Structures are given as structure tokens and as C-alpha cells.
């Protein structure tokens, strides 16, 4: 496992998120659930607790975008970047954006599981860099699987930043 330079992390365990926009690819309820389950991956093994809000600035602002979408880190059409997220911090820190020039599914088709990409993206949003462990959620490659389970590399990494729940 790895961290960003200087190991940035959230200075509190209660973290807010907000879904600012949606994709036409999936029902909004499916999108919401995908994100909820992606956060639960991490709250399973840390004292981090993620609360949704529908107004104001959440710690983790979630949105879909295409090409240049307001942060000066443009997406690139279909293929290439699927999504990105910023390391923990104020403002754009923690924010997680998904390239809607990709087809968002739950893993089937010429497309990508929103749950799996979100879980990976949220790893970055929590302060994890890419892992050299190929079986890790934080591996730099997307691999689809029907029954996802957080690897020991991911667990050890995230807990080195936040500890385990008592």
C-alpha cells in the first residue's frame, strides 16, 4: 500500500458526502446505492463514518463530468481516465468525479462497475495512493469481480492512516 506525499488524511472520523449530479446510464437510486456501498467498503475497517447531505459543501463532493468540468483536470472522452479523486484536504480535497463519457453499469457491457470505480476513487479521497499489490482495490488497474472483498493490503494501508474501530 502507499500514501500521498506527506500522508494527508481527514482530521475527523465523521465525513460528509454530497452527490451533485447524475449519469443517464443508471437509475439515481442505483447510483446512490453504488456510492453508499463504496463508502461502506472503507467504513467496514476504520472508524470513518460517511453521512450524506443534500445542501451545502460536503467534505466529499461527488459528481459526473465530461472533458473540462471545472477543476482544470479535464476528462478525455471514452477510455483513458474513468474517474478521479483528490487527496484529503479542504476545498477540492476529497472530491470524486466520474467521467460520464464512460458507460456506467454494475460491471457488464462495454463499461464499468460504478461501485468498483467509486470504491477505488474513494480510496484516494481517503488518502491512499496506488498499491503495488495486484489484488488490492488500490491497484492501478480496474479488474471486475462479481463478489468484491477488500484485500489485506488495503485494510493495512487505510488503518495505518485511521486505525481500526474499537
Amino acid at each position: 500500500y502507499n500514501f500521498f506525499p506527506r500522508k494527508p488524511k481527514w482530521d475527523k472520523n465523521q465525513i460528509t458526502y454530497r452527490i451533485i449530479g447524475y449519469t443517464p446510464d443508471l437509475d439515481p437510486e442505483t447510483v446512490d446505492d453504488a456510492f453508499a456501498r463504496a463508502f461502506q467498503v472503507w467504513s467496514d475497517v476504520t472508524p470513518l463514518r460517511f453521512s450524506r447531505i443534500h445542501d451545502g459543501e460536503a467534505d466529499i463532493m461527488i459528481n459526473f463530468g465530461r472533458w473540462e468540468h471545472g477543476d482544470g483536470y479535464p476528462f478525455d472522452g471514452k477510455d483513458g481516465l474513468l474517474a478521479h479523486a483528490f487527496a484529503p484536504g479542504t476545498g477540492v480535497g476529497g472530491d470524486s468525479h466520474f467521467d460520464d463519457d464512460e458507460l456506467w453499469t454494475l460491471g457488464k457491457g462495454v463499461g464499468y462497475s460504478l461501485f468498483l470505480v467509486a470504491a477505488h476513487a474513494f480510496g484516494h479521497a481517503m488518502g491512499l495512493e496506488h498499491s503495488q499489490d495486484p489484488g488490492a482495490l488500490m491497484a492501478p488497474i480496474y479488474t471486475y469481480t462479481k463478489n468484491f472483498r477488500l484485500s489485506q493490503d488495503d485494510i493495512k494501508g487505510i488503518q495505518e492512516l485511521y486505525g481500526a474501530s474499537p
Partner: peptide, 10 residues
């Protein structure tokens, strides 16, 4: 497929 450099800093 690669994620590319999807890990950014604020």
C-alpha cells in the same frame, strides 16, 4: 484497464 493518473492532490 488502467485507471491512469486518477489520484490527484488539492
Amino acid at each position: 484497464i488502467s485507471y491512469g493518473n486518477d489520484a490527484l492532490m488539492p
